[PDB]
């Protein structure tokens, strides 16, 4: 019963479901960044 | 650690089910999602 | 002052047992689905 139901490492290969490069809203063009879906509607982007 | 506590469990649950409203439609009889509430996830095959 | 003038209830201080009252009647069952939405543009446009 954990809130994050998967063990996530930053070197895990992308799969497009919970580990993938993404682009969010931006003022202009943005470089995609690797992000991790830790729970439903909850994403984490380990980037400055 | 937040989800382990009772209060934090409630807080995360409320956050998850608080989906941003589909208020993007100029027509009152339609429901349109707002783009800024979404992201683009790049799939392995190259589609997003 | 009217005969219909509403009398207000108390203002209970937020105590731990009231938090437990809401915790025991909280619904943790339903979580909104990650539905399939129509694909947006490649670059999402938006500012803070």
């Amino acid at each position, epitope marked *: 019963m954990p809130f994050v139901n998967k063990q996530f490492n930053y070197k895990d290969p992308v799969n497009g479901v919970d580990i993938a490069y993404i682009k969010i809203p931006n003022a202009g063009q943005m470089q995609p960044v690797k992000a991790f879906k830790i729970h439903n509607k909850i994403w984490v982007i380990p980037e400055r | 650690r937040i989800y382990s506590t009772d209060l934090g469990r409630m807080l995360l649950t409320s956050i998850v089910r608080g989906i941003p409203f589909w208020g993007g439609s100029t027509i009152d009889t339609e429901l349109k999602v707002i783009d800024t509430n979404c992201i683009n996830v*790049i799939q392995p095959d190259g589609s997003y | 002052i009217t005969s219909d003038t509403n009398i207000e209830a108390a203002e209970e201080n937020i105590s731990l047992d009231l938090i437990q009252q809401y915790y025991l009647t909280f619904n943790f069952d339903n979580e909104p689905e990650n539905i399939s939405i129509e694909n947006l543009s490649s670059d999402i446009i938006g500012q803070l």
Partner: nanobody
Amino acid sequence: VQLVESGGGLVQPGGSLRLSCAASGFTLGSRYMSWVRQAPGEGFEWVSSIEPSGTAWDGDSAKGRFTTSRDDAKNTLYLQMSNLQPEDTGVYYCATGYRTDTRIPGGSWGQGTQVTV
């Protein structure tokens, strides 16, 4: 989903090259694409990538040296290399993802093109 590359076999350092990658089964301007090279007896290295919006991103290897272009009408991805170096030797593929560093399930690849410098 078919990808076939075509690029010059060899040239000694100090020159240039144009690699091509012809696609079939989809529209090349609608998916993120990448260029990735593999040196013999080693893993893959992300060379470049191109967005469906036409924006291209190149990694540490050959930034300012290589440029990634794409022709929508021809449905063909181009890699214009200049100032090649001996450490750029390997087999070059046009991978189907963004920053494609390994083989990922559901991802399409090409057979490769030999480049020796």
